[PDB]
Structures are given as structure tokens and as C-alpha cells.
Design a protein around this ligand. Structure first.
Ligand code: I47
Ligand code: I46
Length: 336
């Protein structure tokens, strides 16, 4: 189609004429986001322009990664791709990438911030995060940085997860990541959901750590210092010296810490915020918890198609990553 050009916040935007009335809404991962009206579909959309998508090998691979991830995700509670385009007419001229999705009006950081949610709202918002995570996790994808600011929400409380798989943000991070364990599992995301849910219910950051050390201190204050079963799983001499040097802490009584909350919410919280990540509830199990009795339907909580992440192990030239991304743009098929 016919492109047209404009400057918005120092940044140039060259987009097809179908997208009208571009309006800056803020920063995205590795780029800027504009709200727009899609004259073809009649949809309000969000367009992200990647900044310097092919600046280095790291950027090139990251651009490919995000495009591959967005092309794969087709789920109500996960951001997906409505369109992807470039003003470039050929591979040699290919230097910019624009990604388009449904416009979402706010995020949970905007919502919780100075606005108290009812237990009914929390059930629905957390149900939707878990339903999305079930899907993401079934594709062997980990979010790794789940936090209120990457949960997009509309005025009717429909929620989508963004910025998954790209990999303070500290506040929502699993303690095994604070300890720098490289073999963490998908349940790091469940830890983050627990932190988020706690905050939705209480109106305060559960673990507002001032650094990595402070963050673990705050976590261990609630959940206790590791037991013997967990300590035996820590290979790192240094990590063990640190953890075993702290004054032992008992696990607190969650019913007391979150007193006044729905006892079912308290129960789910204790299953999510388990120190040993092997013992944490999974997204699929969490959906079946009684807290979500009014929302849960196992016939309407789909899993994802298999997703090939083998490229992640590959070390390629910028031009190779760029060409792979270009072919992914050209092969894009929009949804129905
Ligand atoms: O922090 C803020 C605002 O202060 N924001 C929260 C994050 C928010 C945001 N970040 N990234 C996207 C995005 C856009 C298109 C694609 Cl294909 C993929 C990701 C959005 C967004 C914005 C609106 N609707 C949908 N996505 C931008 C605004
Ligand atoms: F203070 C602590 C101690 C251990 C964890 C922890 C939770 N789940 N898994 C681990 C873990 C397993 C193996 N090696 C590690 F380094 C960490 C988290 C905080």
C-alpha cells in the first residue's frame, strides 16, 4: 500500500495510509507506541515502532524474537499481531519494523495506583492473567518479567499480557532469580502473579525491595528462610553462605498477613508464593482453584500450538537475523 510520513516526539513514523490519527501513548519494549485508527478493519490499534531493530547482533536477534513471538500468540489474554509492516520495498532497503495490535487503554499499574479493587475484580483480573499464562507456558515460553505495567487492561476489565519472552521490575521477581540461578522454571511467572494479586488486594507493593539483597530479605520475611529440602538443591557455595548466614525466619501466617481478604484468595496466595519453585502451583492448576469457581471453564482455557525456539541457540550474522525477520514480515497472514 501507500505509505505516509510524519514526526511524533522526535521519532519519524512511516505507516500505510490505512492507519490514521496516530497519537503517542508511550514507550514499549525496544520502541515507541502510537494509538491509531485502522480504517480497513474499523479497529482502534496500537502500533509499535522498533527503534534501531538491526543496530547490532543483539538487537537483530531480539527483533526476530519479538516478531516470532507475536506471530505465534493467538489467545484472548495475550497480545497478538494484527499486522506487521515496513516501508522498505526490498531486503537491502529493510531497516524498520512496525508491529500492530488491538489498542488497550490502560495497564494494571494505572489501575491499582490509587484505586481500590474489590475481590470480584481481582478474581477476574488474576483469572485472565493465569489463562494467558497457561497458554504462554504450554508453548514452553516464560514471561520472566511479569508486572503490573505489562498487563494491559480495557475499561471492561479485559486483560492481555504483553512483553512476554523478551527477557522496579525487581519487586515482582522470583527469589531464585534474585539469587541468580540459571535453571529457573516457568513458575517464576507464578511468583510474579502472587505478588501482583497481593498488591491488587492490599493496595501496596508486597515486596518493595531497594536492591537485590533487600528484595530477598523482604521475601524471606514473609515466606521464611529455606528449609533443608530446598537448601540441598543450591549448588552455589556463595549463595548458600549468604542464605544460611541470615537469621532464620519462620514462614508467616498468610491468613494473618492478608487478614480481611477472601480466605480463598489467601489460600491461592500461599500456593503461589512458595519459596521452593518445585512446589509452586502451575497456571493450569491455579485456574482450577476454587477462587476462580465463577470464571473457570476447562473447555475454554486453550493451550498453544508448538513454538520453535531453536533459533535461540543460534549465533548468526546481523544480515542473517535481518533476512530471517524480513521473511517473517513477508509471510505474515493477518487473522480473520
Ligand atoms: O507504560 C505505558 C504508558 O505509560 N504503556 C504500557 C505498555 C504499552 C505497550 N507497550 N507495548 C505495546 C505494544 C504495542 C503493539 C504491539 Cl504489536 C506490541 C506491544 C503497548 C500497547 C499499548 C496499547 N495497546 C496495546 N499495546 C504502552 C503504554
Ligand atoms: F533464598 C532462596 C533459596 C532458594 C531459592 C529457590 C527457590 N526455588 N529454587 C530455588 C533455588 C534452587 C536451586 N538453586 C538456587 F540458587 C535457587 C530461592 C531463594
Amino acid at each position: 500500500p501507500t505509505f505516509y510520513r510524519q514526526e511524533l516526539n522526535k521519532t519519524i513514523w512511516e505507516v500505510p495510509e490505512r492507519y490514521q490519527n496516530l497519537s503517542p501513548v508511550g514507550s514499549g519494549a525496544y520502541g515507541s507506541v502510537c494509538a491509531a485508527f485502522d480504517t480497513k478493519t474499523g479497529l482502534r490499534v496500537a502500533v509499535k515502532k522498533l527503534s534501531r531493530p538491526f543496530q547490532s547482533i543483539i538487537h537483530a536477534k531480539r527483533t526476530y524474537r519479538e516478531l516470532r513471538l507475536l506471530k505465534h500468540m493467538k489467545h484472548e489474554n495475550v497480545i497478538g499481531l494484527l499486522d506487521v509492516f515496513t516501508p522498505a520495498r526490498s531486503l537491502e532497503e529493510f531497516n524498520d519494523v512496525y508491529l500492530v495490535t488491538h489498542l488497550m487503554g490502560a495497564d494494571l499499574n494505572n489501575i491499582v495506583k490509587c484505586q481500590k479493587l474489590t475481590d470480584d475484580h481481582v478474581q477476574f483480573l488474576i483469572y485472565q492473567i493465569l489463562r494467558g499464562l497457561k497458554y504462554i507456558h504450554s508453548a514452553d515460553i516464560i514471561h520472566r518479567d511479569l508486572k503490573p505495567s505489562n498487563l494491559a487492561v480495557n475499561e471492561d476489565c479485559e486483560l492481555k499480557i504483553l512483553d512476554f519472552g523478551l527477557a522496579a521490575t525487581r519487586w515482582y521477581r522470583a527469589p531464585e532469580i534474585m539469587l541468580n540461578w540459571m535453571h529457573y522454571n516457568q513458575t517464576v511467572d507464578i511468583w510474579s502473579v502472587g505478588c501482583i494479586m497481593a498488591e491488587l488486594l492490599t493496595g501496596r507493593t508486597l515486596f518493595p525491595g531497594t536492591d537485590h539483597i533487600d528484595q530477598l530479605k523482604l521475601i524471606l520475611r514473609l515466606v521464611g528462610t529455606p528449609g533443608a529440602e530446598l537448601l540441598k538443591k543450591i549448588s552455589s557455595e556463595s549463595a548458600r553462605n549468604y542464605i544460611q548466614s541470615l537469621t532464620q525466619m519462620p514462614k508467616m501466617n498468610f491468613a494473618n498477613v492478608f487478614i480481611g481478604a477472601n480466605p480463598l484468595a489467601v489460600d491461592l496466595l500461599e500456593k503461589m508464593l512458595v519459596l521452593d519453585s518445585d512446589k509452586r502451583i502451575t497456571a493450569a492448576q491455579a485456574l482450577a482453584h476454587a477462587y476462580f469457581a465463577q470464571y473457570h471453564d476447562p473447555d475454554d482455557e486453550p493451550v498453544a500450538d508448538p513454538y520453535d525456539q531453536s533459533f535461540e541457540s543460534r549465533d548468526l550474522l546481523i544480515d542473517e537475523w535481518k533476512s530471517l525477520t524480513y521473511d517473517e514480515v513477508i509471510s505474515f497472514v493477518p487473522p480473520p
